[PDB]
Short mmCIF file of C-alpha atoms and ligand atoms in Angstrom, two decimals:
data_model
loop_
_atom_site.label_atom_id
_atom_site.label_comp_id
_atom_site.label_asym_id
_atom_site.label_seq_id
_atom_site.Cartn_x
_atom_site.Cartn_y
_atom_site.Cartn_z
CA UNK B 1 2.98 87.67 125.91
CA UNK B 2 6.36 88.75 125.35
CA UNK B 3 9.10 85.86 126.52
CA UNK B 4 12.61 86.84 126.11
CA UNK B 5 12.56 90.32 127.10
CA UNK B 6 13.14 92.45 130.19
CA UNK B 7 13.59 95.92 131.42
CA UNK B 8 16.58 96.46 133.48
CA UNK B 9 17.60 99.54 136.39
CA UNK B 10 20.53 100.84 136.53
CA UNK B 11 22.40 103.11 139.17
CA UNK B 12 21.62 106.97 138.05
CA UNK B 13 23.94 108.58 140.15
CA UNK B 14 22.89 111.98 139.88
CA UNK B 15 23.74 115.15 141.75
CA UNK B 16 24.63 118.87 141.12
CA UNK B 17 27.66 117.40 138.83
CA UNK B 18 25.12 115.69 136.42
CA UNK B 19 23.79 112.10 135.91
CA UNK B 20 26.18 108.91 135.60
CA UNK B 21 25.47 105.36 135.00
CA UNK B 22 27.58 102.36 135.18
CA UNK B 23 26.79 99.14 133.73
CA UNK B 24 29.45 96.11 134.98
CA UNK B 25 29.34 93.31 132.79
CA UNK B 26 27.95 89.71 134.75
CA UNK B 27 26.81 92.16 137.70
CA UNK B 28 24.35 95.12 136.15
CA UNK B 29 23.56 93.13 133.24
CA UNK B 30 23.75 88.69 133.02
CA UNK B 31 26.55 88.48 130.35
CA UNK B 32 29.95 89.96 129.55
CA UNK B 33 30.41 92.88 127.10
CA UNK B 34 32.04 91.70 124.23
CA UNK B 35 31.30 94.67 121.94
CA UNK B 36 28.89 97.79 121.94
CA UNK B 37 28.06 99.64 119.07
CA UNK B 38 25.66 103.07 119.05
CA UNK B 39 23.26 104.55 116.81
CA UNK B 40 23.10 108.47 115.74
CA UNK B 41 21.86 110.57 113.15
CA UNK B 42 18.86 108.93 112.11
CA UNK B 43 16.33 110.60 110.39
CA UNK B 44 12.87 111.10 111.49
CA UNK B 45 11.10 108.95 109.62
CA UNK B 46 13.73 105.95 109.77
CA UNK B 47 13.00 102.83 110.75
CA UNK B 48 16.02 100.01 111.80
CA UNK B 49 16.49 96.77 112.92
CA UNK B 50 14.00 94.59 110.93
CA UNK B 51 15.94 90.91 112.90
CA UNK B 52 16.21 88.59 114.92
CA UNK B 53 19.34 86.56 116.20
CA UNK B 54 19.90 83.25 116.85
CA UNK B 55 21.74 83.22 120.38
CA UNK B 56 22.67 86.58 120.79
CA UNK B 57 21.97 88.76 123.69
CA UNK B 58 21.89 92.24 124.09
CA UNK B 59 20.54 95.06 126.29
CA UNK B 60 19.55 98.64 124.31
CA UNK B 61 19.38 102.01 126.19
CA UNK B 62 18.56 105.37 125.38
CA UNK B 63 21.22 107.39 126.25
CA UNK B 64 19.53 111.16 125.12
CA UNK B 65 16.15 111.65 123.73
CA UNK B 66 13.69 108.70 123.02
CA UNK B 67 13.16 105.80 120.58
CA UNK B 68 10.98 103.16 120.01
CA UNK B 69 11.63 99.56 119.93
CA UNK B 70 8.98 97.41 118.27
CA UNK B 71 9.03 93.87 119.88
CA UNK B 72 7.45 90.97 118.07
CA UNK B 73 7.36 87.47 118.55
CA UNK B 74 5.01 85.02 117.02
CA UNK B 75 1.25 86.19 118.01
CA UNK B 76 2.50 89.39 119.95
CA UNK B 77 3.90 92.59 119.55
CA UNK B 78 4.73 95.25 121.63
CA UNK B 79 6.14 98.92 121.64
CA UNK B 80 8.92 100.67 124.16
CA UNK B 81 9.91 103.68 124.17
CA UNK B 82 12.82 104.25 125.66
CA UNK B 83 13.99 107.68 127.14
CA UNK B 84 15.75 107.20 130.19
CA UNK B 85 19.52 106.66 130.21
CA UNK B 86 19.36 104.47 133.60
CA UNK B 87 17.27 101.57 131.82
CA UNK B 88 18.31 99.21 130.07
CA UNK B 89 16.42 96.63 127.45
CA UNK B 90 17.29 93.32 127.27
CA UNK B 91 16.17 90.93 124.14
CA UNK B 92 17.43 87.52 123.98
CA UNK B 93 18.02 85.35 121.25
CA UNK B 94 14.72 85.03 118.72
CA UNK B 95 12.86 88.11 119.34
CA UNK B 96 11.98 90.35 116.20
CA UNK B 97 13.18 93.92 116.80
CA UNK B 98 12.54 97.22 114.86
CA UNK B 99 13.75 100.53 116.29
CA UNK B 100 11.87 103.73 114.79
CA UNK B 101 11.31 107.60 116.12
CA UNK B 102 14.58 108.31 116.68
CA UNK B 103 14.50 111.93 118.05
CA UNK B 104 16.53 114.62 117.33
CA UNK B 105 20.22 113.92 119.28
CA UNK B 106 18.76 110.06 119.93
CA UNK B 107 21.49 108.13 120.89
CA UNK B 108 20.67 104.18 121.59
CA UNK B 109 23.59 102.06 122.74
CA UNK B 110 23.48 98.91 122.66
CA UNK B 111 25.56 96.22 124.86
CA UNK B 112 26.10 92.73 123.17
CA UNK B 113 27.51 89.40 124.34
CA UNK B 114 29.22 88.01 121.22
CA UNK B 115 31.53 89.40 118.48
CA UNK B 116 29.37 90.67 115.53
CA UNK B 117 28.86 87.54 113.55
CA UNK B 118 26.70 88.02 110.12
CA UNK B 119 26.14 83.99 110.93
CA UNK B 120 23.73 84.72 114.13
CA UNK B 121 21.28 87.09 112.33
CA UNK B 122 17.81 86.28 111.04
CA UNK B 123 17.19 89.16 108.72
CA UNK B 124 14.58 86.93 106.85
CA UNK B 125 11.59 87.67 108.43
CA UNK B 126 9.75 84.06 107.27
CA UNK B 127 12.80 81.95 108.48
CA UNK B 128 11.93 83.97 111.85
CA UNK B 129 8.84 83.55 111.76
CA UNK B 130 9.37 79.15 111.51
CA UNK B 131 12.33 79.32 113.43
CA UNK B 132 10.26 81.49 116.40
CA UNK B 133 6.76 79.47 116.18
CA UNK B 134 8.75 76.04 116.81
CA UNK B 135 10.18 77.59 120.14
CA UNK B 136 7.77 79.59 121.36
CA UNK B 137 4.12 77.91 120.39
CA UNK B 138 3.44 74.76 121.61
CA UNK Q 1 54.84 115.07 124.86
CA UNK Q 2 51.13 113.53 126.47
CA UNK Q 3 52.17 109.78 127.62
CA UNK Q 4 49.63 107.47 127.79
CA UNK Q 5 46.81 108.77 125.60
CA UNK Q 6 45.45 108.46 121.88
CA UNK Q 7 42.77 109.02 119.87
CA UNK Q 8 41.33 105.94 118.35
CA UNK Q 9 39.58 105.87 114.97
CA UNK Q 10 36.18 103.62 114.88
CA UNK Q 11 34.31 102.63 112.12
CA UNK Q 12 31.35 104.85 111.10
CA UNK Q 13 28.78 102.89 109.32
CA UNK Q 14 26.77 105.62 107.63
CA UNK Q 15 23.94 105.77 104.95
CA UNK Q 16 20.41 107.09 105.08
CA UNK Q 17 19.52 104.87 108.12
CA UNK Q 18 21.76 106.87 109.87
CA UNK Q 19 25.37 106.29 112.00
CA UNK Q 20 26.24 102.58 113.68
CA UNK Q 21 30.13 103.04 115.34
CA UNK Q 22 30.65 98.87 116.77
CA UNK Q 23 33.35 98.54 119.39
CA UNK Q 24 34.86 95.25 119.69
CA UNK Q 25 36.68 94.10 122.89
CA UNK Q 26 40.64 93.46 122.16
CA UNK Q 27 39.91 94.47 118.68
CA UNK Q 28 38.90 97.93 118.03
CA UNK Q 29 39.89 98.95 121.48
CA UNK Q 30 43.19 96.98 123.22
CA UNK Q 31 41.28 95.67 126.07
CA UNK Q 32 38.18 93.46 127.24
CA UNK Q 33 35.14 95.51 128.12
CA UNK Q 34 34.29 94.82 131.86
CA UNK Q 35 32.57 98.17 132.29
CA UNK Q 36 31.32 100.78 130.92
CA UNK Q 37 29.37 103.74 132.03
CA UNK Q 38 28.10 107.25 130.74
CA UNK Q 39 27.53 111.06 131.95
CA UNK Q 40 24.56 113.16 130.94
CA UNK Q 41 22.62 115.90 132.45
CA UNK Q 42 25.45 118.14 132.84
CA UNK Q 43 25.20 121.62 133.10
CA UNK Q 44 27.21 124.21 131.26
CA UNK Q 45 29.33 125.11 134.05
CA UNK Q 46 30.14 122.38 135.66
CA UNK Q 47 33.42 120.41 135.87
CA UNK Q 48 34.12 117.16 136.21
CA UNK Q 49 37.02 114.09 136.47
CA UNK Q 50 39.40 115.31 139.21
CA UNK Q 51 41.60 112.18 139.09
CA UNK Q 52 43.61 109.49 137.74
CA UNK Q 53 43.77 106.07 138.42
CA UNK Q 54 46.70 103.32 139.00
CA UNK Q 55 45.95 100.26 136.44
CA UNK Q 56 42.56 101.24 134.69
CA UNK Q 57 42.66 101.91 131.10
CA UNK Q 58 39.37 103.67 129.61
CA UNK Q 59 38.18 105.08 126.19
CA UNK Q 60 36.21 108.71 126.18
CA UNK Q 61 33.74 108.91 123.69
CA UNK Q 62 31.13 111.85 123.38
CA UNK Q 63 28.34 110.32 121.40
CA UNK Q 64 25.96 113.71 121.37
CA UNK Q 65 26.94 117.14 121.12
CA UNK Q 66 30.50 118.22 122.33
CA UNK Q 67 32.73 118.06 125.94
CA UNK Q 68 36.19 119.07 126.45
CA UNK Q 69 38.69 116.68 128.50
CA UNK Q 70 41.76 118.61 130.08
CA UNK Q 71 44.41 115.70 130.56
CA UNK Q 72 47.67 116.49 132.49
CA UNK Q 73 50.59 115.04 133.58
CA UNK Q 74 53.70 116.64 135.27
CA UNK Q 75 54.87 119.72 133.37
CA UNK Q 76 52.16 119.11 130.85
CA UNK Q 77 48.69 120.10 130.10
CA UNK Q 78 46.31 119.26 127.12
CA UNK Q 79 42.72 119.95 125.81
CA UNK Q 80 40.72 117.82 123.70
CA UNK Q 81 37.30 118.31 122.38
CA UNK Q 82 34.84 115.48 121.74
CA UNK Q 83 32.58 116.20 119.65
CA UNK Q 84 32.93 112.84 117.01
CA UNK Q 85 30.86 108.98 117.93
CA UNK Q 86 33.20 107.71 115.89
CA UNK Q 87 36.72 108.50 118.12
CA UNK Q 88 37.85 107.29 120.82
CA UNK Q 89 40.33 108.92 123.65
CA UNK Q 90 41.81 106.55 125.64
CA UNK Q 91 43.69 107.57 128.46
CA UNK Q 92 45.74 105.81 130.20
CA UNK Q 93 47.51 104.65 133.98
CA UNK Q 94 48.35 107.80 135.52
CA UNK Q 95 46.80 110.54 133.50
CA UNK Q 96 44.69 113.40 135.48
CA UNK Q 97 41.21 114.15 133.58
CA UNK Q 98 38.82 117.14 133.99
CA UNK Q 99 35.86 117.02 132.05
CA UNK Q 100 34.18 120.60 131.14
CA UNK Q 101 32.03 122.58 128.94
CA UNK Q 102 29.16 119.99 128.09
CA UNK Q 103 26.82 121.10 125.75
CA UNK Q 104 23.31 119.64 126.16
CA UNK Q 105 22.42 116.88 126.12
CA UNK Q 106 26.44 115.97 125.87
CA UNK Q 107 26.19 112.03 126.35
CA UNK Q 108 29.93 111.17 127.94
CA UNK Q 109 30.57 107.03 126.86
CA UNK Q 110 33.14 105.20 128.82
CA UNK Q 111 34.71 102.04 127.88
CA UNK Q 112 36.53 100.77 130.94
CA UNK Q 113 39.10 97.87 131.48
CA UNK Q 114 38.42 96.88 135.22
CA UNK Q 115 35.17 96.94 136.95
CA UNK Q 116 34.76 99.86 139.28
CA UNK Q 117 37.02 100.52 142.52
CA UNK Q 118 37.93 103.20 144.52
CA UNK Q 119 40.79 101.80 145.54
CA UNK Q 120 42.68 102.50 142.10
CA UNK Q 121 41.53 106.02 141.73
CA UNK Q 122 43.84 109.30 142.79
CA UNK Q 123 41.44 111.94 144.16
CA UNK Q 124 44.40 113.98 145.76
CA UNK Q 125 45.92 116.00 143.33
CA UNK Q 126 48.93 116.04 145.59
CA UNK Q 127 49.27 112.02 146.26
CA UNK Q 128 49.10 112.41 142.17
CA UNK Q 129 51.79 114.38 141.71
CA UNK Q 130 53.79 112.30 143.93
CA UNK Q 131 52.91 109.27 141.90
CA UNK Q 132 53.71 110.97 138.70
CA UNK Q 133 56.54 112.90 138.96
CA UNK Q 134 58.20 109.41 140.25
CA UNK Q 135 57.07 108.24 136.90
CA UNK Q 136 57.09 111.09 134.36
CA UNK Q 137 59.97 112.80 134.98
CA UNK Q 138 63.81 112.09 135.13
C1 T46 Z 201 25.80 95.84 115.09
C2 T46 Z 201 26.86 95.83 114.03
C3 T46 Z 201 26.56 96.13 112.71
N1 T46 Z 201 27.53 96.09 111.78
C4 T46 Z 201 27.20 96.45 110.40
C5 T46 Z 201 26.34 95.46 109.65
C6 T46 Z 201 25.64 96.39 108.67
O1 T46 Z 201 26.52 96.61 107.59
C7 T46 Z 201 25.53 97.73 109.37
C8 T46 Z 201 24.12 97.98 109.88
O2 T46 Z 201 23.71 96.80 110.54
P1 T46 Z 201 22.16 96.55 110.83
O3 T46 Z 201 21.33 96.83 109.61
O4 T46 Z 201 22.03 95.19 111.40
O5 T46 Z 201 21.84 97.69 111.92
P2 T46 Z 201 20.43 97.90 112.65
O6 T46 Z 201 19.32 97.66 111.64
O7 T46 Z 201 20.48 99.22 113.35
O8 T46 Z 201 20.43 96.69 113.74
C9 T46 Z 201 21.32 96.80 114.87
O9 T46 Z 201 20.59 97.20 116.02
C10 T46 Z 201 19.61 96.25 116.46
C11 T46 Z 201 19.10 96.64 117.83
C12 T46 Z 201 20.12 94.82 116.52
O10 T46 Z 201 19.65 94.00 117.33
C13 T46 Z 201 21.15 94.36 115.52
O11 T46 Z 201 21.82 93.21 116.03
C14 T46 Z 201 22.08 95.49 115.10
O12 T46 Z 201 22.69 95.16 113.84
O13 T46 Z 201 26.45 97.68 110.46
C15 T46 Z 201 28.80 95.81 112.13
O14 T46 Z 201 29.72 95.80 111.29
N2 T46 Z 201 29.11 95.53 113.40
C16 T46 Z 201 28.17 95.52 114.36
O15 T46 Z 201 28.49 95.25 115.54
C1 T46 Z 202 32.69 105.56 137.10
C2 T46 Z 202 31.87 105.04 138.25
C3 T46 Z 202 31.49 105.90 139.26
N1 T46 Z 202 30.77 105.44 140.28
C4 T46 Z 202 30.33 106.38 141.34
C5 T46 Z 202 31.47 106.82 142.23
C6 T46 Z 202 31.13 108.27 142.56
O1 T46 Z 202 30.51 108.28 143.83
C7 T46 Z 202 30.16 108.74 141.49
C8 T46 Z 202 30.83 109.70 140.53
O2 T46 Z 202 32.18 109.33 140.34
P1 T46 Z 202 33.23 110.40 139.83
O3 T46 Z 202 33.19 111.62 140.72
O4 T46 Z 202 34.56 109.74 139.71
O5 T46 Z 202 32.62 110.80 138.41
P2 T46 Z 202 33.43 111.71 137.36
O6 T46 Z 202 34.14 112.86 138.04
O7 T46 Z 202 32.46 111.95 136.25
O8 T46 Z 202 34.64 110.77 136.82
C9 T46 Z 202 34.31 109.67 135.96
O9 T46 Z 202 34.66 109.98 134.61
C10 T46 Z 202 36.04 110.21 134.38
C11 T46 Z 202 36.29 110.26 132.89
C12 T46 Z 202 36.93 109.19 135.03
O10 T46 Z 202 38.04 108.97 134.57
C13 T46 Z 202 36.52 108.51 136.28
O11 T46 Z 202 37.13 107.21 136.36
C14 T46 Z 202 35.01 108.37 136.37
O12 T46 Z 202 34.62 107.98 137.70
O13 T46 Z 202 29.76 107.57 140.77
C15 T46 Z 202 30.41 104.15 140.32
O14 T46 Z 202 29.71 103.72 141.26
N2 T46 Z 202 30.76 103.28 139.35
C16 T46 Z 202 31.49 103.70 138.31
O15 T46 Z 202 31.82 102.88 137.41
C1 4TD Z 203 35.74 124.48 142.69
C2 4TD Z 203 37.13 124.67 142.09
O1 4TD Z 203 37.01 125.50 140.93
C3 4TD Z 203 37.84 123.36 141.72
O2 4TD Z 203 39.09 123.17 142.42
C4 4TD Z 203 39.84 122.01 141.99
C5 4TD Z 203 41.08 121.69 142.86
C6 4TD Z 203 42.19 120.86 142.15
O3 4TD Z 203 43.04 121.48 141.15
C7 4TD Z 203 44.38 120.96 141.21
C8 4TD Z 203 45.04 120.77 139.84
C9 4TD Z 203 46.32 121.59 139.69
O4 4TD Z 203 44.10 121.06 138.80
C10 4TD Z 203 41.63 122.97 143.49
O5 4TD Z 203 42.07 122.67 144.82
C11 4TD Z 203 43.41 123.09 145.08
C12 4TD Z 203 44.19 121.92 145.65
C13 4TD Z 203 43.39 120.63 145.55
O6 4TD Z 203 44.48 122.13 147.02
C14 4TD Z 203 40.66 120.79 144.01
O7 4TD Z 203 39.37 120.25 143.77
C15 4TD Z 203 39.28 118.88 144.15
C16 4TD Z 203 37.81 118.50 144.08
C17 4TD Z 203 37.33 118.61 142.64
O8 4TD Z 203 37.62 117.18 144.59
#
């Protein structure tokens, strides 16, 4: 089963003015915000992601419409959609991660607590996969 | 002459995977990320912002659809429409915001450079005057 991972609530403060949620880095989420980036305009039948990272952290939401995030680790995999702009998901460091049906106006934000560093990646999905089974099989 | 605001240009990483726009702390914005929080949900005739603030600096970004941000100061008055993930507005100390015309489903992004507290906002549109007009104006 899938270590690593978490879904978090956030305040949806929501009233005839609309919906807003805020996200405080070390309080709503465990780390500071050192960058965001967002995803938009993906096509239908686009898949992303296809990674892992080394000690990153980060925590995806789904700020209109829905995606899905396929989560994998060695011997397990699991599916989220997410579609609900007051949860967050969290994957830690040496998780495999695909995104894929984006919908139409999907925007997925992601909040991360390093830099970007090319360095912390694992886009080579055997290195993941011997890097992953020493941590999490026993 | 609209003191204390700009547009800032992000990188748009585009291709047929679709749009990534990063934001960096200190680097593609002039401040740490401590906060950030977004609006949704907002129907067509609603209006919202009604303030300023003392010390917090914070980038506007409308990552779906479009929203239009009045920004005043003394003697001045401004409209911008968001309708671009890949720029920024930041508005400064001391600038009044009023946020109107969402589209659906508008998603309102806010990069902010303090956590939240009331005790820096300006609800009074008087008390802000007061403020500004001591700082705008000769
Ligand atoms: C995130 C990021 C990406 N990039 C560049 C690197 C590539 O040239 C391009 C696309 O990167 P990538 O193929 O890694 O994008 P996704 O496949 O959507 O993966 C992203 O979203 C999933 C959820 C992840 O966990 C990754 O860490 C994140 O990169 O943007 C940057 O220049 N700065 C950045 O901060
Ligand atoms: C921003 C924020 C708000 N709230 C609570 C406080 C209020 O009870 C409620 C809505 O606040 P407000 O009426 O100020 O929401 P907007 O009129 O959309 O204004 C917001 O967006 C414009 C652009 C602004 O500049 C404001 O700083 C920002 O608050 O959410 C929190 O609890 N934490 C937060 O970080
Ligand atoms: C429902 C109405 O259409 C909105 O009225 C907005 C307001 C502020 O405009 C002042 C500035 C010149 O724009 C008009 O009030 C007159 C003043 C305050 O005495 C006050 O609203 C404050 C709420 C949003 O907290």
């Amino acid at each position: 089963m899938l270590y690593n991972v978490a879904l978090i609530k956030f305040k949806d403060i929501a009233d005839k003015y609309g919906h807003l949620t805020p996200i405080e880095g070390k309080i709503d989420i465990p780390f500071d915000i050192k960058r965001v980036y967002y995803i938009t305009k993906v096509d239908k039948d686009i898949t992303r992601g296809y990674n892992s990272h080394k000690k990153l952290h980060q925590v995806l939401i789904c700020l209109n419409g829905s995606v899905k995030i396929r989560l994998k680790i060695p011997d397990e995999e699991k599916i989220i959609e997410l579609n609900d702009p007051s949860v967050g998901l969290y994957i830690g460091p040496l998780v495999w991660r695909e995104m894929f049906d984006f919908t139409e106006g999907c925007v997925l934000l992601v909040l991360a607590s390093e830099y970007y560093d090319e360095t912390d990646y694992i886009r080579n999905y055997d290195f993941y996969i011997d890097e992953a089974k020493k941590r999490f099989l026993e």
